[PDB]
Amino acid sequence: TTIMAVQFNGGVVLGADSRTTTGSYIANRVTDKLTPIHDHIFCCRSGSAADTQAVADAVTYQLGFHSIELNEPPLVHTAASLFKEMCYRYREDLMAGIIIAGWDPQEGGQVYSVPMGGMMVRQSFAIGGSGSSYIYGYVDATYREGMTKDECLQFTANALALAMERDGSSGGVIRLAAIQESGVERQVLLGDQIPKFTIATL
Amino acid sequence: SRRYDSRTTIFSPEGRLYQVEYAMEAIGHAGTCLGILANDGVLLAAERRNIHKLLDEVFFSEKIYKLNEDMACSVAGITSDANVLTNELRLIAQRYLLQYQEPIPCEQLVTALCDIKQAYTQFGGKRPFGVSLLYIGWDKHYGFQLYQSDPSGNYGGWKATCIGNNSAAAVSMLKQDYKEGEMTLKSALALAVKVLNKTMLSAEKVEIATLTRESGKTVIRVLKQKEVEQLIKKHEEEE
Amino acid sequence: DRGVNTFSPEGRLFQVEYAIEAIKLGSTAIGIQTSEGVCLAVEKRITSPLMEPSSIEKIVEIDAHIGCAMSGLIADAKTLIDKARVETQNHWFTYNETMTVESVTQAVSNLALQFGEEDADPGAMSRPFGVALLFGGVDEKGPQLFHMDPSGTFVQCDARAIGSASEGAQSSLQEVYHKSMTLKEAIKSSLIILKQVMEEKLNATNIELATVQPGQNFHMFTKEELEEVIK
Amino acid sequence: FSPYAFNGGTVLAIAGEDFSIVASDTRLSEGFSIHTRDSPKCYKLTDKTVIGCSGFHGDCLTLTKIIEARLKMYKHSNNKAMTTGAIAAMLSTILYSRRFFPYYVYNIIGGLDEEGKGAVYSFDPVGSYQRDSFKAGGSASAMLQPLLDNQVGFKNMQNVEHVPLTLDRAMRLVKDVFISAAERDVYTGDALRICIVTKEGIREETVPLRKD
Amino acid sequence: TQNPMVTGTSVLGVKFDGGVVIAADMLGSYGSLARFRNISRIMRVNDSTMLGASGDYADFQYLKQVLGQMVIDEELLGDGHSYSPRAIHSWLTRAMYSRRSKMNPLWNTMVIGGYADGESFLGYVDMLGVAYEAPSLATGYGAYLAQPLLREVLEKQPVLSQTEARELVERCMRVLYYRDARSYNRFQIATVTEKGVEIEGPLSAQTNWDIAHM
Amino acid sequence: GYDLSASTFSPDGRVFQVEYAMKAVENSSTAIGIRCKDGVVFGVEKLVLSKLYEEGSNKRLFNVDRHVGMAVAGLLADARSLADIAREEASNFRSNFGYNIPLKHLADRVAMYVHAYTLYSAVRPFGCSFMLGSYSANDGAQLYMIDPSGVSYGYWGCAIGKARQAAKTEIEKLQMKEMTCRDVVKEVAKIIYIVHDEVKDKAFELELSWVGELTKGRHEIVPKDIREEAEKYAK
Amino acid sequence: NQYDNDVTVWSPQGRIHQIEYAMEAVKQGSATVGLKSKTHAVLVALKRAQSELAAHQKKILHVDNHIGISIAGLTADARLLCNFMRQECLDSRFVFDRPLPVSRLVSLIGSKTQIPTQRYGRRPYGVGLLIAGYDDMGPHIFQTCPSANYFDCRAMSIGARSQSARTYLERHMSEFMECNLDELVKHGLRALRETLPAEQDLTTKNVSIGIVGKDLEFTIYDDDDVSPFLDGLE
Amino acid sequence: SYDRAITVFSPDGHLFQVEYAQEAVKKGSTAVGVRGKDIVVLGVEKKSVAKLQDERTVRKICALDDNVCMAFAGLTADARIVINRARVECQSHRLTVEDPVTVEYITRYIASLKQRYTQSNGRRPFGISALIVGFDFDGTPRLYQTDPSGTYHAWKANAIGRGAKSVREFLEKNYTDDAIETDDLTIKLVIKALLEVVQSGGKNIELAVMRRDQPLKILNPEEIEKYVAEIE
Amino acid sequence: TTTLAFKFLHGVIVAADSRATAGAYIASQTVKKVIEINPYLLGTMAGGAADCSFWERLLARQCRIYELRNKERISVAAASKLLANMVYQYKGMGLSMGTMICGWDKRGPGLYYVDSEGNRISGTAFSVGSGSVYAYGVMDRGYSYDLKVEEAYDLARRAIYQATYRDAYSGGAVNLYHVREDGWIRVSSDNVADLHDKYS
């Protein structure tokens, strides 16, 4: 599993792989690891499929009820705070690394990383999953401030592709998402659309 | 909360429990339930109150209930309250059989239910069960037995007893007609018919169950329409 | 009708006030504190001659150094007496030392107002105890005589009388009492007063007597001992 | 995860005719490092009772606070201060309360009794205790004990005057055994805090020990 | 927690003439990998108190939010009674010990620095509930690499000035960068005096690599 | 006997026990709240019933949160308990969602908690009304008022207590929408002085609180200088 | 009549009779005076002995090293609240290793005493307290009661016939701040004398004194130690 | 759960519920008890003498243990509950302690229970009086009597029920050291006291006896008819 | 630890050592292994110092309460049963205590052995502790029911002395007790070193 979220002026750009494996067997090759918490709040999921699905469900139930009582669009930081609370409270059982990303009128496009322990840190871009180890040096040398919405989409696709080619637990297709004040822009990059990188030959 | 409370489980000036006393008045208007113990069995004779042309038969008995293999009972008073007690009696007998792997003696079963009825007149703040019961059964300690409990938890063993509507006139007619030690099932059944006719009779207006022993096995059975009808005709011959 | 925790217009709890009226029906108990020790006395009030006088126990030993005379509803006293006994036994187990008379009385005084219907479990008092207590023991401060009533109010006294004739006995205690009395003088005066507020001819089986000196432990006078003091 | 830690330390107690001494080193360590060179292990309970605690410092702090609170509660309900013997009895039951997850502390209570004589009570982690003339607990407890048996109890000595132990002489002995304990025990060092308990309150002293 | 996830390294702390200074790098490690390089491990409790923490970062955030709410509750009363540094250190010790007694410890080693009533306070509270005060503290790997240097300077100069303490703390960070593999070259420096708490940084130490050639 | 319990409706559909709790709020001293262009100003006419009391005792203004103020009227014992309840909601909210609780949500939460004591005979309705005021950079200035039944509305100017009907009139005159907190302080101070009964009541102290842009969104008591400067202008 | 049996029953006048019935107990008890200065806070209770042979009941209790109280009303209830006050004080010393601010402890009592007045079946604590403490904000004098309301005063007095004591305090509540220890303790004794009838006077058998100052822990004076303060009055 | 206070004090310091429970005991059957030298007799007056009733199921004299037995007066349903609790306590005392319970020990336990129902929420007091009789380990005849309030006393001869005032009065001037000389005069004494209150004295008087180191024996219709004829 | 108790014709003889050991280091040489429950009841300790001390003290409290309630002393059989029921609740938890309850009640001199395992047996001659095996040999070889009081003291003393000579965890002094009809009495307390010079 490889998830990534980058932020720009308008909002954020989420992306992930679609491989769900059990040992060396791929149970699902077209998994959707990008779950919508609210209208402009999404979350990438990594770790345990049942743990992250139960946590994402709970947060979605709470955030929607909270948004109705307040009669206001929920803040991205509040969604991150609800994920953080559950992931810390049940840190011994749950095995989930959630990246929360979205857009709100008070703070714009924000990306929050909520790793395994249950801490919560805001970043300009974040990467998680088992395949994220292979792309730490690339996102460090390639990311620059002032990227546009389209540049974030290419940068995210390039990083996910590099990780998918090296990680055994990553693969499939790339599912991107662009969140803005407007709405969400979901898009899949299949086989040939996936950015390619030549292999050193002799 | 302390103003709506009717205080059902408290003593009165003369030392009597009103709720229990009022519940015994409800049993005095119910269908007549009589029990007669013989040397070779014991029977129950309850007058059917559910009398209507549009009333279906469905069940095997309306007032007589089988508690376990060797015990049957007859309720009187609030029928809904009797449904709670009969179900508890069966659970008490099944519990005893799961612990000792043997049938529960008649007196031990009656005592367990009388302890539950006594508890509703002492604490809990709830109304008592307005139902009087009549137990007939056979055990290996005292053979054939006939018991009778009441709303207060009181209970006693009898040779022949009657409860419900007009149970006073039946008891007085049973004392001058019963033969201590020399009563047969056939003669006991005749006495039951002469008591139900006096405190009243058609064959649909009554229900008769007998409990006898056959080859080291208790047998409880409700007398059939024809089976009872003949009895009713034979009492008319003597009248 | 009202609840058990209902305050009256003056400022007193009805229930507690009614329980204080039940203490003025029991037999008279007299306590006297001296420098030689405390002496407790109480009439047995034998109703019928067929009843065994020894079966009646109005004076009990809380501990080796603490005695206790009661009055009012004797059945209610048993609940309090046991608490006092366990309290002193717990103290010994935890601090390897005896408990003071003041400490014991205070511990038994905490159960006085611990009653009420609502917001309570099954094992809770529904009403207050209708009994007054007279604790008399010997500790580090020498002989001491405390008095506890139904309201949970305990004090210290040199000579206190509880019961139906406490009012009359009190006057006699104030007349015949000084702060230099001997234990033998305290006992004599106790019997005299107890003998004036009685109906039956005070004998050796009609009353109860016990003393708690600094030296010996709680001792209950025997028939012969009581008969030799009546002389 | 282990809930215990050995922080070293060594408490010494000595009872006299009209006094009581409770001394200990002030070094607190962990593993092979030194946390602080200024950590007394002697706690003043009442005006004639002093307690020494060595072992797991975490338990030492908690136990010390529990005792202090218990002394205040006892004074509130009994209108008097707790005696040394009563505190020792109460401590025994406090240590046995956590019988299945015991305090890793070696307690030693040194004060005066009701007759004004020096009283010393040594304790075991689960609560077992007894009154003694002198006692040593901690990392150097097996190094000092033998010397005290010889110098204070005159064990294994033939023709000897058996002269009564005096405050002056007791002070010398305490300082001497701790000087020897600092040379061999790696957990004992820095400074030595001495608490003298007489009839005129508690006095405190401080002697410098080896730093290495 | 039983297994610490993202943790921070050692925290330095020294007392000077009129205040306490606390330093700690801004790195949260996940095993041997430096994951989060821009997190603060030092917090401001109130006007006189500041806290530094090493170990599990998630446990530090929970403590930071609990402590923060305590200060708000106390300031809401407005009765002229505020928590002193010693009272915060005491509360922490009890909290750390309570969690360790239930076999569910907060994997943290805290350093408490404060200044109240003209007296600088420097407390230490570990995960087991072991607490004590000292002129200079150092957690984690700082106890073996920074404590020796800090202690050597406080033996000749027991009382330091603000400038002396600040520059002595920067020498310790430089040594930590050189010898601790779980450290970062970007740290923060918090100082507490009579004027309050002041968090400085992100700062860097000046390293020398002349030994690479020789 | 239709008015003996809160779980009993009367023949004409009324809960008398709840109306009796609002009668206790009418015996209290008048407290007023005014929301200007950048904050809220609170003013209570604290009645000093004894000379032995310390200046500042029995204050009817609390701090439920850093950005929230609370003016009460009625039973002080009850009001203090409601203030604690409001402090918990605000504290719990911050722990859960990670940010300061909006004033509207705080009012809602507390009003619903107050409404729960007006349904059964197991308890009794609160006998005190209170106003909640706070200022936020994005939210603006808010002023709510909760009565004994549990009803809570937003206001511009509000008054509760003895002379709340007479203090309201003198509040409509002022144009708080275009006014400012600094100027409103005196206005509120003057209103409290006009409605204060000096022929029936004794002596009183002026309690003033405010939250807005001038105090950086933090609720706090009006400074002595300003308090005395407005006290002289209202005299 | 129908509105004076339960605490959860509001009367048609907006009052709770039961709560006012618990305030009648405070006025039926012995008078107690509490006054303070710039460095000291004292309490002077008039221990009353119903029987001639009985010992005057205690009125001043110990809560902590810096806090002392004087009860009035129900004895059992006073011990109930005192035990709670001691518990809270012990908690603060255990957790924060410091004395619990008098004002904070008084708020805790207010919360605990309010709960009973709103629940069915329960009753209000029928006891009036006179708390005397000294923290970081100097000496304090607090007065609690059965309606769960507490006030911060410069001088206070509660109990039977304490209106005369209260009135006397108002006349001299201007020289208490500068008043020295003995002078401050004489004013309390003088104020307590007003409540007493013309016949009897303040002896050493019916007067208790609790004092708490900056460097002085809460101390109580029984019979022998009360003499020093007593001797000097006119 | 029901937690309403049933037994409370009244204006003149009276516990109405306990007094109403004692009124129920006066309407109950009469039960006399006599303590002899080496025998203990318990006689009860069978109010209902129905001929169609099984006499073995309505007995009033029970057994708590091998050395302790008892009779009661008042609510029969309440007595059963009390007797069953006392029976369970006897076996509990034989478990923990390695010896039989004394007569006073079980009397104290039965009295303790009765008192508890007079000071507990949501429950009324027991409406019965017990006459515990038995022998201790030394072989001493004991006779105790408990009542609804929870107070117990050791007696020499006592009667409880409707005609207890009369029986007691008659017993007062009949119970001596010569009237209980043997094991037959004690039985003739119990029957004499019962005969001056029981309607149609003779077949309406059940009575059991208990001798030292011996179970409990219940005289039958013939045995009791010889004692009733002897008197005449 | 070595504790022994035997009941002859003149009551019960109770002897024990006084050594406490924490591993291989001798913690104490003056520990009291006999507990005076009351004037007529004694209790011995072996195994866990804190365990024995605590539960025997709890037993003493129960005995005292028992006497106040029934106005009579508890029997030796009843006292030992109380201790057996007490420690049975924590069976398997790790409690380590072997005790001997001795006294004189209505059935004469009573001697019971109770441990943490669950055993509660009555007998005439018991021995608990690590040196109990050595005491048994000497005790049984010279034990007689007609033994004179002086002879009974020498037997018990010698039995304990030989156990301290062989067992490394036994030593100190031999504290001896004698339970009679009038109550127990502290017979003697001789050091093991002084007994060594007397037996050689």
CSV table of C-alpha atoms in Angstrom, one decimal, chain D residues 1-5 7 28 30 33-39 56-59 61-62 65 98 101-103 211, chain E residues 2 90 93-94 97 100-105 107 124 126-134 137 143-144 147 151:
chain,number,residue,atom,x,y,z
D,1,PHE,CA,7.7,-3.1,29.5
D,2,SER,CA,9.2,-3.4,33.0
D,3,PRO,CA,7.6,-1.3,35.8
D,4,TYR,CA,10.7,-1.5,38.1
D,5,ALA,CA,14.1,0.1,38.2
D,7,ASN,CA,18.1,3.4,41.7
D,28,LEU,CA,20.3,8.5,42.7
D,30,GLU,CA,20.0,4.2,36.9
D,33,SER,CA,24.6,6.6,35.0
D,34,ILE,CA,24.0,9.1,37.8
D,35,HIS,CA,20.7,10.9,37.8
D,36,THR,CA,21.5,13.4,40.6
D,37,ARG,CA,24.1,13.6,43.4
D,38,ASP,CA,21.7,15.4,45.8
D,39,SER,CA,18.8,13.0,46.6
D,56,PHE,CA,12.8,1.9,43.2
D,57,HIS,CA,12.7,5.7,43.5
D,58,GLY,CA,9.3,5.8,41.8
D,59,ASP,CA,7.9,3.6,44.6
D,61,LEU,CA,8.1,8.8,46.2
D,62,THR,CA,4.6,7.4,46.1
D,65,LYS,CA,3.4,10.6,50.0
D,98,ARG,CA,0.0,-4.4,47.2
D,101,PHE,CA,2.5,-5.9,42.8
D,102,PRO,CA,4.7,-4.9,45.7
D,103,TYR,CA,6.7,-1.7,46.3
D,211,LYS,CA,32.2,11.3,43.9
E,2,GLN,CA,3.4,-0.8,25.1
E,90,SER,CA,4.3,17.0,40.8
E,93,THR,CA,5.0,12.5,38.4
E,94,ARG,CA,1.6,11.3,39.8
E,97,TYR,CA,3.3,6.7,38.1
E,100,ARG,CA,2.8,2.7,35.1
E,101,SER,CA,0.9,1.0,37.9
E,102,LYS,CA,-1.8,0.0,35.5
E,103,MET,CA,0.9,-1.4,33.1
E,104,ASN,CA,0.0,1.1,30.4
E,105,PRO,CA,2.7,3.7,30.7
E,107,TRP,CA,6.3,6.3,26.9
E,124,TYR,CA,12.7,15.5,35.4
E,126,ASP,CA,10.5,9.6,33.4
E,127,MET,CA,7.9,7.0,32.3
E,128,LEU,CA,8.3,4.9,35.4
E,129,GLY,CA,7.4,7.8,37.7
E,130,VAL,CA,10.9,8.5,38.7
E,131,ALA,CA,11.2,12.2,39.5
E,132,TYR,CA,13.9,14.6,40.8
E,133,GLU,CA,15.3,18.1,40.5
E,134,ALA,CA,18.8,19.1,39.3
E,137,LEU,CA,19.1,17.6,32.9
E,143,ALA,CA,22.6,11.6,29.7
E,144,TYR,CA,25.6,9.9,28.3
E,147,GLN,CA,25.2,15.5,30.9
E,151,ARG,CA,28.0,18.7,34.8
